[PDB]
Design a protein around this ligand. Structure first.
Ligand code: 2AY
Length: 557
C-alpha cells in the first residue's frame, strides 16, 4: 500500500528556475544576509520523492466509525448545486496552467467556444466513464525560505478542462459542507480576528486548559484509498443533482483515489495512490480526514472535552488537563491512535498551558493594546519566511505577492506594519503603482487587490484597532528584533524613520493614497491623527473571503 511508485523519470521544470536570492538596487534596504534566502527548485525533487514514498497501514476501530457516522448525519443536511460551465469558468485564475488541448486560462475566463466545447466533452466523459485513471502533471514548487535546505514540495494536478469540471461538480460542496460537518471546529470560516476570538473563548471555556498542535508528517502521502472513499461517502450524503453524484463518483474513482504522474516533458514519472495536492478537494478532503482521525484519536486517548480547530492538515486541540504528566501520557496514546489511522507525527505533540505558546497554521495568539489602553488579542507569527519572501519580491515579480497577503492577514502585527507596509509602499510610490491590482492568496484562493484598498480591507477584517495597536508583548518584540539581526534587516528604529517619509509622500498624493498614509502609518508620527471609520470600507464585497480553504484548488475570487 505504497503512497507512490516511480519509473525513474525526473520531475522536470517548465521554465528557468532560480535558487539564489535575486539582487537589485532595493534589496539591501530590506535584507543584507542574502545567502540565508533561497528558493526550492526541481533539482531537489528526487529527495522529496524519497520522503513522500512509504507504505500506509490502517487499523480502523469503533471510535473512527462512530465519529464518521456523526459526520455523515450532519453532511446529510447539506444541499449543493451543480455550477454551470460559465460559472466554473469565472472561478479560474487568469494565470492558471493552460490545457494540453489547445486553450488556456484566459480562453476559459472569456468563455471561448474552444475552451467551453472541450469542458463539455470532459464533463460528458466523466458521466460515461467512472473507471479510466485521469492524467496528472507532477511539478516541483518554487517556494522561498530562510536556511535552518528543504527539498522542493510537489504539486500534482489534472488538466485545466478537468479542473473546470471539478468546480462544476464540487465547488458548492467544498465551500459549504465543511462548516456544516465540523461547525466551529472548521478553521477556514474565520478571519484572523475571529480565529483569535475562537481560540481565546475555547481556552477560557476549560476549567484547567491544555492545548497542543498536532503535526502529521507528509499529510497528503498518509491519505489512503480508504480515506478518499470515506470523503466521497461524506460528499454523497449531500442533496445533489443526479449529474453531480455521477461526476463526484467518477472524479473519485478516476482522479482523487490515484492516477499516473506525468512530468512537464510528457514522460511517465510513476503512479499516485494518495492525496493529489492540486485538486479542488485537497483542502476539504484534508480537513475532513484530519478532523475524523483526530476526533476519533481524542476518544481513544480519553482526552476530556476536546475542542478541535482544523484547517486542512493543520490541527489544534484544546481540552481539559489531567495533570501535566498525565497529559504527556495522554498525548502518546493520541499519537498512537493517529498512527493506527495512518496519520503519524512529524514532531511529537507537546502539551501547552499558555495559549500564546501554541503554534497553529505557523501562527500564535499574542497581546497588544489599543488607543484606549485595552488589552487586544491578535494573530502573529515568526516573521522569518514572510521577510525572506518579501526580499525575493523586492527584486522579482512573482505570480503570488506574499507581502500583500501577509499585510492583509497580519495587518495588526508589529512586523507587517513597520516593515512590510513601509517597504512595499515606498516601492509602489516610486513606480507610481499604488492603483495597480496585484495577485495574492487568502486561504489558498487567489484575489486581485489594489494596494490603495488596504485601509478599508484591514478595517473590515481586523477593525480600526489594527491602526492603533501599541505596547506589544516583550516576547513578540524580542522575536521580531532577533529575526531582524539574523536576516540582516535594519532595526525597527530605521523603519519608523522611513515610515515618516513614506507617510508624508502618501499624504502629498491626496485621495486614496492619503488615506493609506493616514491609516497605515499613524503609528509612525508622534502627534497621532484621530482615526474614524473609512466610508469606503462599508461598500466592500468581502462575502467569500473567509468561507472555505482552497489550497491547490485553482480558485480565483
Ligand atoms: C488559518 O491559518 C492561516 C492560513 C492557512 C493555514 C493553512 C493550514 C493548513 C493547510 N493545509 S491544506 C494544503 O491541507 O489545506 C492550509 C492552510 C491555508 O490555506 O491557510 C493562511 C494565512 C495566510 C497568510 C498570508 C497570506 N495568506 C494566507 O492565507 C493565515 C492564517 C491565519 C493563522 C493568520 C488565520
Amino acid at each position: 500500500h505504497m503512497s507512490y511508485t516511480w519509473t525513474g523519470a525526473l520531475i522536470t521544470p517548465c521554465a528557468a528556475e532560480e535558487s539564489k536570492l535575486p539582487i537589485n538596487a532595493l534589496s539591501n534596504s530590506l535584507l543584507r544576509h542574502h545567502n540565508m534566502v533561497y528558493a526550492t527548485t526541481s533539482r531537489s525533487a528526487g529527495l522529496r520523492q524519497k520522503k513522500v514514498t512509504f507504505d500506509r497501514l490502517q487499523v480502523l476501530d469503533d471510535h473512527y466509525r462512530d465519529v464518521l457516522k456523526e459526520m455523515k448525519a450532519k453532511a446529510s443536511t447539506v444541499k449543493a448545486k451543480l455550477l454551470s460551465v460559465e460559472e466554473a469558468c469565472k472561478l479560474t485564475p487568469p494565470h492558471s496552467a493552460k490545457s494540453k488541448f489547445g486553450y488556456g486560462a484566459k480562453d476559459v475566463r472569456n468563455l471561448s467556444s474552444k475552451a467551453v466545447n472541450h469542458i463539455h466533452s470532459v464533463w460528458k466523459d466523466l458521466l460515461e466513464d467512472t473507471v479510466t485513471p485521469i492524467d496528472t502533471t507532477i511539478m516541483a514548487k518554487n517556494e522561498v525560505f530562510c536556511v535552518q535546505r528543504k527539498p522542493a514540495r510537489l504539486i500534482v494536478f489534472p488538466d485545466l478542462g478537468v479542473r473546470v469540471c471539478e468546480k462544476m461538480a464540487l465547488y458548492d460542496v467544498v465551500s459549504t459542507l465543511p462548516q456544516v460537518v465540523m461547525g466551529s471546529s472548521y478553521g477556514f470560516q474565520y478571519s484572523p480576528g475571529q480565529r483569535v476570538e475562537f481560540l481565546v473563548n475555547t481556552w477560557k471555556s476549560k476549567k484547567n486548559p491544555m492545548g497542543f498542535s498536532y503535526d502529521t508528517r507528509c499529510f497528503d502521502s498518509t491519505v489512503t484509498e480508504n480515506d478518499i472513499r470515506v470523503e466521497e461517502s461524506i460528499y454523497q450524503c449531500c442533496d445533489l443533482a443526479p449529474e453531480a453524484r455521477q461526476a463526484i463518483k467518477s472524479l473519485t474513482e478516476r482522479l482523487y483515489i490515484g492516477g499516473p504522474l506525468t512530468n512537464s516533458k510528457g514522460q511517465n514519472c510513476g503512479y499516485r495512490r494518495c492525496r493529489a495536492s492540486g485538486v479542488l478537494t485537497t483542502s476539504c478532503g484534508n480537513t475532513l480526514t484530519c478532523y475524523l482521525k483526530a476526533s476519533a484519536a481524542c476518544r481513544a486517548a480519553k482526552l476530556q472535552d476536546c475542542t478541535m480547530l482544523v484547517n486542512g492538515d493543520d490541527l489544534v486541540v484544546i481540552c481539559e488537563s489531567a495533570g501535566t504528566q498525565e497529559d504527556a501520557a495522554s498525548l502518546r496514546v493520541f499519537t498512537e491512535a493517529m498512527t493506527r489511522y495512518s496519520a503519524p507525527p512529524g514532531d511529537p505533540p507537546q502539551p501547552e498551558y499558555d495559549l500564546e505558546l501554541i503554534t497553529s497554521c505557523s501562527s500564535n495568539v499574542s497581546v497588544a493594546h489599543d488607543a484606549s489602553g485595552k488589552r487586544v488579542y491578535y494573530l502573529t507569527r515568526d516573521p522569518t519566511t514572510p521577510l525572506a519572501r518579501a526580499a525575493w519580491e523586492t527584486a522579482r515579480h512573482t505570480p503570488v505577492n506574499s507581502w500583500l497577503g501577509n499585510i492583509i492577514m497580519y495587518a495588526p502585527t508589529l512586523w507587517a506594519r513597520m516593515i512590510l507596509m513601509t517597504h512595499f509602499f515606498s516601492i509602489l510610490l516610486a513606480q507610481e503603482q499604488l492603483e495597480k491590482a496585484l495577485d495574492c492568496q487568502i486561504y489558498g484562493a487567489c484575489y486581485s487587490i489594489e494596494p490603495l484598498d488596504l485601509p478599508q480591507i484591514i478595517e473590515r477584517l481586523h477593525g480600526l484597532s489594527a491602526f492603533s495597536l501599541h505596547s506589544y508583548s516583550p516576547g513578540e518584540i524580542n522575536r521580531v528584533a532577533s529575526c531582524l539581526r539574523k536576516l540582516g534587516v535594519p532595526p525597527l528604529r530605521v523603519w519608523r524613520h522611513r515610515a515618516r517619509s513614506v507617510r508624508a509622500r502618501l499624504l502629498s498624493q491626496g485621495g486614496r493614497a492619503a488615506t493609506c498614509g493616514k491609516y497605515l502609518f499613524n503609528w509612525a508620527v508622534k502627534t497621532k491623527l484621530k482615526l474614524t471609520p473609512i466610508p469606503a470600507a462599508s461598500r466592500l464585497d468581502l462575502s467569500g473571503w473567509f468561507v472555505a480553504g482552497y489550497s491547490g484548488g485553482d480558485i480565483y475570487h
